[PDB]
């Protein structure tokens, strides 16, 4: 229908802070995007947190 | 004894008919009390016969009360007789026709069930007998 | 739920209101994805009077590569169903839509049936 629907643009520029640009179709023309799923720390964030931070004995030996 | 919910408060009477061909068989229990005589049996005689044969067995076995009243009888007061105003919370009544099993019993030997079923048949306005599970 | 049961349910919905009479027959259509069908039938004797189809006009003007039902072949089969029952004694007819809503090629099919003077 006309006159009610928002402008669904085909040229939507997805800009990453790591100098990567991909094309998607959406509302805005430009999208400044953070941690988006390709090269996201979901393989290393669960490696750094809940998997390696727990220590009580090797913390004790570093002060003696 | 008495139904909890009643679909209709007062309900008029209904006349006895021939031999009940459905409720004549024995479902549970080994022995039974078959009625030869069509009349009404209130919940009061059912309490009397139930206490009679439960306390006449008194060691083992279980009885089976078959019938439930499901219809009321409205007794008018002594108020010079014209209306059927309120008689619904008064005594309930079970219709029994011939053939129908009234009581059953199991876990009891021969003559202990003969005195159990036969003594508890004296608490009852209609002539009966005891029936073996054939 | 499905589309075919929806069409059949719409056609039974239409059939309650319109009935074939011995004075006025009823012509029903079927717009299959390859072919149209049109049936001048008489319900009180339970037999057809004048049936045509895309397999009748398709001797001369058809393209099976294209989507078979077009508005132009609806114009043509309304033309031949308008001149096929006129030579039989069928002037005053009771048109129903065949379970399909009227805004389509059945516009020009019905008006094409009106083009040869049929009392619609």
């Amino acid at each position: 229908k006309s006159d009610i629907h928002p402008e669904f643009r085909e040229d939507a520029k997805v800009y990453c802070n790591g100098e990567l640009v991909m094309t998607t179709g959406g509302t805005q023309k430009d999208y400044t995007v953070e941690v988006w799923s390709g090269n996201h720390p979901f393989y290393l964030g669960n490696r750094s947190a809940l998997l390696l931070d727990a220590d009580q004995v090797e913390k004790f030996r570093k002060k003696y | 004894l008495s139904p909890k919910r009643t679909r209709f408060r007062k309900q008029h009477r209904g006349r006895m008919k021939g031999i009940s061909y459905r409720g004549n068989r024995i479902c549970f229990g080994r022995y039974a009390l078959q009625a030869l005589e069509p009349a009404w049996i209130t919940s009061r005689q059912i309490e009397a016969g139930r206490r009679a044969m439960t306390r006449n067995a008194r060691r083992g076995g279980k009885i089976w009360v078959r019938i439930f009243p499901d219809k009321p009888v409205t007794v008018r007061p002594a108020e010079t007789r014209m209306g059927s105003g309120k008689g619904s919370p008064e005594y309930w009544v079970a219709v029994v026709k011939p053939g129908r099993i009234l009581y059953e019993i199991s876990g009891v030997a021969e003559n202990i069930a003969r005195r159990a079923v036969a003594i508890a048949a004296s608490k009852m306005p209609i002539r009966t007998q005891f029936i073996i599970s054939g | 739920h499905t589309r075919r049961e929806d069409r059949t349910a719409r056609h039974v919905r239409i059939r309650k209101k319109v009935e074939g009479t011995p004075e006025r027959p009823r012509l029903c259509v079927f717009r299959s994805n390859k072919h149209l069908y049109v049936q001048v039938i008489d319900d009180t004797k339970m037999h057809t009077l004048a049936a045509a189809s895309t397999m009748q006009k398709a001797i001369s003007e058809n393209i099976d590569y294209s989507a078979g039902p077009t508005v132009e072949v609806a114009q043509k089969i309304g033309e031949m169903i308008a001149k096929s029952c006129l030579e039989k004694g069928i002037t005053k007819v009771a048109f129903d839509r065949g379970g399909y809503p009227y805004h389509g090629r059945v516009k020009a099919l019905a008006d094409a049936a009106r083009e040869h003077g049929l009392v619609f």
Partner: protein, 175 residues
């Protein structure tokens, strides 16, 4: 553009993974549907306008304020009241917003659970639901101080034990 990535690579390995015999028996995603569960939108008039403008910029098209199926006592619900504002988008918008669930919901969730093998498991026709990301990053987020409801139900054609979970697994939904 992920429909072209949907065509040639992730359909034939579902064709040979289940060991079919024909092409069209392989299932596909049918439609997704978003609702905004709101109990107070006749009073909050600018929250319903926030659903129209803001939620119409969340999804592809304008959402629909939903009239009440019945009136339940206790709540402020009458016959025909706005109980949530929903939208049903479908087509290439469907691929574009499951795409926006790959891009805008999978790496930007504070939790790291993703698709769940213990949720949306058993259905007659398999449906996947999420309660996440009340505002997309296209909308200036700090205006709406209310965590409004938002559910995105995906639909499929399959009636199996494997195929929808592998369908979201082949797309950008790790866990």
């Amino acid at each position: 553009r992920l429909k072209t990535n949907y065509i040639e690579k992730m359909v034939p390995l579902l064709k040979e993974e289940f060991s079919y015999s024909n092409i069209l028996e392989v299932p596909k995603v049918v439609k997704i549907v978003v609702n905004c569960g709101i109990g107070d939108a006749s009073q909050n008039a600018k929250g319903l306008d926030a659903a129209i403008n803001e939620l119409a910029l969340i999804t592809g098209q304008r959402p629909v304020k939903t009239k009440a199926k019945t009136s339940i006592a206790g709540f402020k619900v009458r016959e025909g009241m706005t109980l949530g504002i929903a939208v049903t988008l479908r087509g290439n918008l469907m691929y574009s917003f499951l795409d926006r669930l790959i891009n805008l919901a999978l790496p930007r969730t504070r939790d790291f659970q993703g698709v769940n093998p213990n949720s949306f498991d058993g259905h007659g026709n398999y449906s996947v639901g999420f309660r996440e990301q009340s505002v997309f990053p296209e909308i200036k987020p700090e205006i709406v101080g209310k965590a409004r409801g938002m559910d995105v139900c995906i639909t499929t054609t399959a009636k199996t034990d494997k195929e929808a979970y592998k369908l979201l697994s082949l797309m950008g939904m790790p866990f």
